[PDB]
Enzyme design. Structure first.
Site, PDB file in Angstrom:
ATOM      1  N   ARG A  58       0.816  -1.225   0.000  1.00 47.90           N
ATOM      2  CA  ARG A  58       0.000   0.000   0.000  1.00 47.90           C
ATOM      3  C   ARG A  58       0.850   1.275   0.000  1.00 47.90           C
ATOM      4  O   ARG A  58       0.343   2.351  -0.337  1.00 47.90           O
ATOM      5  CB  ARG A  58      -0.944   0.029   1.204  1.00 47.90           C
ATOM      6  CG  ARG A  58      -0.243   0.067   2.553  1.00 47.90           C
ATOM      7  CD  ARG A  58      -1.219  -0.010   3.753  1.00 47.90           C
ATOM      8  NE  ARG A  58      -0.392  -0.155   4.945  1.00 47.90           N
ATOM      9  CZ  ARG A  58       0.046  -1.317   5.427  1.00 47.90           C
ATOM     10  NH1 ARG A  58      -0.315  -2.459   4.862  1.00 47.90           N
ATOM     11  NH2 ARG A  58       0.855  -1.336   6.479  1.00 47.90           N
ATOM     12  N   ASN A  59       2.121   1.146   0.398  1.00 44.72           N
ATOM     13  CA  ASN A  59       3.073   2.270   0.386  1.00 44.72           C
ATOM     14  C   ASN A  59       4.099   2.175  -0.742  1.00 44.72           C
ATOM     15  O   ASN A  59       5.176   2.792  -0.683  1.00 44.72           O
ATOM     16  CB  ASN A  59       3.774   2.413   1.742  1.00 44.72           C
ATOM     17  CG  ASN A  59       2.933   3.163   2.759  1.00 44.72           C
ATOM     18  OD1 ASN A  59       2.177   4.071   2.409  1.00 44.72           O
ATOM     19  ND2 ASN A  59       3.074   2.801   4.025  1.00 44.72           N
ATOM     20  N   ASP A  63       5.348   7.121   1.769  1.00 47.46           N
ATOM     21  CA  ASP A  63       4.739   6.973   3.086  1.00 47.46           C
ATOM     22  C   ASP A  63       3.542   7.920   3.135  1.00 47.46           C
ATOM     23  O   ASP A  63       3.700   9.132   3.255  1.00 47.46           O
ATOM     24  CB  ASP A  63       5.763   7.276   4.181  1.00 47.46           C
ATOM     25  CG  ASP A  63       5.275   6.914   5.576  1.00 47.46           C
ATOM     26  OD1 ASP A  63       4.076   6.643   5.764  1.00 47.46           O
ATOM     27  OD2 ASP A  63       6.113   6.912   6.504  1.00 47.46           O
TER      28      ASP A  63
HETATM   29  N1  LIG Z   1      12.370   9.525   1.241  1.00 48.04           N
HETATM   30  C1  LIG Z   1      11.544   9.031   1.886  1.00 48.04           C
HETATM   31  C2  LIG Z   1      10.528   8.446   2.685  1.00 48.04           C
HETATM   32  C3  LIG Z   1       9.282   9.186   2.991  1.00 48.04           C
HETATM   33  C4  LIG Z   1       9.009   9.577   4.286  1.00 48.04           C
HETATM   34  C5  LIG Z   1       7.861  10.267   4.603  1.00 48.04           C
HETATM   35  C6  LIG Z   1       6.939  10.568   3.625  1.00 48.04           C
HETATM   36  C7  LIG Z   1       7.197  10.195   2.327  1.00 48.04           C
HETATM   37  C8  LIG Z   1       6.167  10.499   1.310  1.00 48.04           C
HETATM   38  O1  LIG Z   1       5.825   9.598   0.555  1.00 48.04           O
HETATM   39  N2  LIG Z   1       5.577  11.731   1.374  1.00 48.04           N
HETATM   40  C9  LIG Z   1       4.508  12.097   0.538  1.00 48.04           C
HETATM   41  C10 LIG Z   1       3.584  11.208   0.026  1.00 48.04           C
HETATM   42  C11 LIG Z   1       2.565  11.679  -0.782  1.00 48.04           C
HETATM   43  O2  LIG Z   1       1.614  10.776  -1.259  1.00 48.04           O
HETATM   44  C12 LIG Z   1       1.486  10.469  -2.599  1.00 48.04           C
HETATM   45  C13 LIG Z   1       2.498  10.700  -3.499  1.00 48.04           C
HETATM   46  C14 LIG Z   1       2.308  10.365  -4.826  1.00 48.04           C
HETATM   47  C15 LIG Z   1       1.092   9.799  -5.162  1.00 48.04           C
HETATM   48  N3  LIG Z   1       0.678   9.383  -6.403  1.00 48.04           N
HETATM   49  C16 LIG Z   1      -0.540   8.884  -6.334  1.00 48.04           C
HETATM   50  N4  LIG Z   1      -1.212   8.387  -7.439  1.00 48.04           N
HETATM   51  C17 LIG Z   1      -2.526   8.000  -7.388  1.00 48.04           C
HETATM   52  O3  LIG Z   1      -3.259   8.008  -6.410  1.00 48.04           O
HETATM   53  C18 LIG Z   1      -3.021   7.547  -8.698  1.00 48.04           C
HETATM   54  C19 LIG Z   1      -4.075   6.477  -8.759  1.00 48.04           C
HETATM   55  C20 LIG Z   1      -4.417   7.879  -9.150  1.00 48.04           C
HETATM   56  S1  LIG Z   1      -1.282   8.873  -4.773  1.00 48.04           S
HETATM   57  C21 LIG Z   1       0.155   9.603  -4.168  1.00 48.04           C
HETATM   58  N5  LIG Z   1       0.305   9.914  -2.883  1.00 48.04           N
HETATM   59  C22 LIG Z   1       2.449  13.022  -1.063  1.00 48.04           C
HETATM   60  C23 LIG Z   1       3.369  13.903  -0.535  1.00 48.04           C
HETATM   61  C24 LIG Z   1       4.387  13.434   0.263  1.00 48.04           C
HETATM   62  F1  LIG Z   1       5.295  14.289   0.791  1.00 48.04           F
HETATM   63  C25 LIG Z   1       8.358   9.509   2.012  1.00 48.04           C
HETATM   64 CL1  LIG Z   1       8.692   9.043   0.382  1.00 48.04          CL
HETATM   65  C26 LIG Z   1      11.025   7.466   3.715  1.00 48.04           C
HETATM   66  C27 LIG Z   1      10.356   6.959   2.477  1.00 48.04           C
END
Ligand SMILES: N#CC1(c2cccc(C(=O)Nc3cc(Oc4ccc5nc(NC(=O)C6CC6)sc5n4)ccc3F)c2Cl)CC1
Length: 301
Positions: A165-166, A179
């Site tokens: 899921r992540n 995340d």
């Molecule tokens: N570097 C790093 C790490 C880290 C630590 C803390 C937070 C993050 C992080 O992910 N932050 C983050 C996440 C996010 O969630 C996301 C990112 C891209 C994304 N693409 C999506 N696509 C869809 O839904 C398509 C079907 C239509 S949904 C989506 N949601 C957004 C912003 C963030 F900062 C991350 Cl990568 C340790 C792994």
């Protein structure tokens, strides 16, 4: 790990700050109790004068100053970690007073890998059907996540919620670790089980994490083993039909493991078992997993 003392890390606005008026907010991609991720169109965030679809994490009704601090710490850690192909990469942030803190990262077209794989059960063949998944795809996703995790480990950071899921799927079969954090409703999500005063991803957690609350890169390796099972089940839920209670935790500590999933190869199942070694120090490292999965990818060809 440096990701537990984030408040001392720098935020260089001259590099990362993106004007709110160049960001066109769209539909939510996920919402939790305190956080959400929104699809947006950012003008010129990463290439001059070019519109780009991005994903924006921000808070929502219910959040307090505490969550605001947490989101700023997330921003700081993303800057510190830096870019890798197999992690969702930071593109910018809006931190100026008068609006919400916004953390802007790459958008991944296909979204979470668990949901995606579960959609492809009728479109899978082990070996080649134009848009079918194959064993090569599944080993390739596994290899990519191992590369991303090896990278994170090199940055002295630990994930703590590694699971399909992540993992997000982008164009050209590129997968990226993320995340979702506060943007996931962990109350409603059955993957997160009440354990005292927290909701935790118990089916993905190493015994030492469950029993001793110890998180290390080698507990991430355990979670990576569970992710492998998810990949090679095409997005099934781990421990099928098992109640996740005190008896589950005891049997796990005792040495009980999942059986091989439907799409696995023998070598991949052994790799899962290796990741699930009771002794953290005896689990493979992510560097070793990268080497091994690379070899399996070649053996597949
Ligand atoms: N570097 C790093 C790490 C880290 C630590 C803390 C937070 C993050 C992080 O992910 N932050 C983050 C996440 C996010 O969630 C996301 C990112 C891209 C994304 N693409 C999506 N696509 C869809 O839904 C398509 C079907 C239509 S949904 C989506 N949601 C957004 C912003 C963030 F900062 C991350 Cl990568 C340790 C792994």
């Amino acid at each position: 790990p440096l990701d537990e003392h984030c408040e001392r890390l720098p935020y260089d606005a001259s590099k990362w700050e993106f004007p709110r008026d160049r960001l066109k907010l769209g539909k939510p991609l996920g919402r939790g109790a305190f956080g959400q991720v929104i699809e947006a169109d950012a003008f010129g965030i990463d290439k001059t004068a070019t519109c780009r679809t991005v994903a924006v994490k921000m808070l929502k009704e219910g959040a307090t100053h505490s969550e605001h601090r947490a989101l700023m710490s997330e921003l700081k850690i993303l800057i510190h970690i830096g870019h890798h192909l197999n992690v969702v990469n930071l593109l910018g942030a809006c931190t100026k007073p008068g609006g919400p803190l916004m953390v802007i990262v790459e958008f991944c077209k296909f979204g979470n890998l668990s949901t995606y794989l579960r959609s492809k059960r009728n479109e899978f063949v082990p070996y080649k059907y134009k848009d079918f998944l194959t064993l090569e795809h599944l080993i390739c996703y596994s290899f990519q996540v191992a590369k991303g995790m090896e990278f994170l480990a090199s940055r002295k950071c630990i994930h703590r919620d590694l699971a399909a899921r992540n993992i997000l799927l982008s164009e050209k079969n590129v997968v990226k670790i993320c995340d979702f954090g506060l943007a996931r409703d962990i109350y409603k999500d059955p993957d997160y089980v009440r354990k005292g005063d927290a909701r935790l991803p118990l089916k993905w957690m190493a015994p030492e994490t469950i029993f001793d609350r110890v998180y290390t890169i080698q507990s991430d390796v355990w979670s990576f083993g569970v992710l492998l099972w998810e990949i090679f089940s095409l997005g099934a839920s781990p421990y099928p039909g098992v109640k996740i209670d005190e008896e589950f935790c005891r049997r796990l500590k005792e040495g009980t493991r999942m059986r091989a999933p439907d799409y696995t190869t023998p070598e991949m199942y052994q790799t899962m078992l290796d990741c699930w070694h009771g002794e953290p120090s005896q689990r493979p490292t992510f560097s070793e997993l990268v080497e091994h999965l690379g070899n399996l990818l070649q053996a597949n060809a």
